Hints:
The first copy, chain A, is mostly beta strands. Helices cover 5% and strands 43% of the residues of chain A.
Amino acid sequence: PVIPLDPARRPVIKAQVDTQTSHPKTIEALLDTGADMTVIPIALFSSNTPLKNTSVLGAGGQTQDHFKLTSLPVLIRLPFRTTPIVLTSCLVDTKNNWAIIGRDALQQCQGVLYLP
Amino acid sequence: PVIPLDPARRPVIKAQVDTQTSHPKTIEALLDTGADMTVIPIALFSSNTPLKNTSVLGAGGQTQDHFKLTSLPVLIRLPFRTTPIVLTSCLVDTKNNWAIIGRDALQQCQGVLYLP
Ligand SMILES: C[C@@H](NC(=O)[C@H]1N(C(=O)[C@@H](O)[C@H](Cc2ccccc2)NC(=O)[C@@H](NC(=O)[C@@H](NC(=O)CN2CCOCC2)c2ccccc2)C(C)(C)C)CSC1(C)C)C(C)(C)C
Ligand SMILES: [Zn+2]
C-alpha cells in the first residue's frame, strides 16, 4: 500500500507482534524511517521474562531509564504479508504504549521511500 | 528517487536550507517519516534571530529545553526538484545539530512510503 506522507496524519499500520513470551497481539505501529530499531510496547511481554537495560539517544535526549532490550527475537506479521518479519532484537518502550516499525523491519518487507 | 531502507544506513539526503536570516546552506538531513515536523540545526541561524521556546516529545521524552521554533518560514531545496519546499514553521535543534526532514516537508514534495 502506498502510504502518503502528511504532517497531520501519522503513517500507521496494524501489525501483529509475537514477543514469544505471551500471546501474539495486534497493535498500532508507526512506520518510521528515522528509527534504526523497532520499538515494541512492554504490555506485549509477560511479567517474568528478563529484559536488558539500554541507553537511547532520541530527540528528547539521553535516557537509560526508558527503553529496555529484548532477550529473544520478535516476529511481526503485517496485514498483507503472510511471512513474518524476524527481528533478532528490538527496543521495549516501558513507559508509553505504542510501537515504532523501524528500518530493521522496513528492510525485511522490501519497504521504500519514494520522492517524485 | 526510490530510497531503499537499511538499519545499518541512515537514509540521509543533501538539502539546501534557507533560514532567511543568513546565507543559504547545504546540510545532510535524515529522511524521517516518524517526524511530524522538520528539525534543522541552530548553526544555520544568525546570532540575533528571535526564536520561540517550545515543547517537543521524542524518544528521550518531552523536552522544554532542547528545541526552538522558527519565527519565519524556512525554504528547503532538494537535489532533484528545482522548486523549494516552504515550511511555515519548523523546529530548531539548539543542543546538538540535528538535521531531520519530517512529514511537513515530505508532503510538499509528494513523498510516499511503499510497502509491497
Ligand atoms: C533510537 C531512537 N531513534 C530516534 O528516535 C530517531 N528519531 C525518530 O525515529 C523519529 O521518527 C521519532 C520517532 C518517535 C516519535 C514519538 C516518541 C518517540 C520516538 N520522531 C520524533 O522524535 C519527532 N517527534 C514528534 O514528531 C512529536 N510531536 C510533538 O512533540 C509536538 N506535540 C505532539 C503531541 O505530544 C506533545 C508534543 C511526536 C509526539 C507523539 C507521537 C509521535 C511524534 C521529532 C521530535 C523528531 C519531530 C528522531 S531522533 C533519531 C535518533 C534519529 C528510536 C527509539 C526511535 C529507535
Ligand atoms: Zn525517565
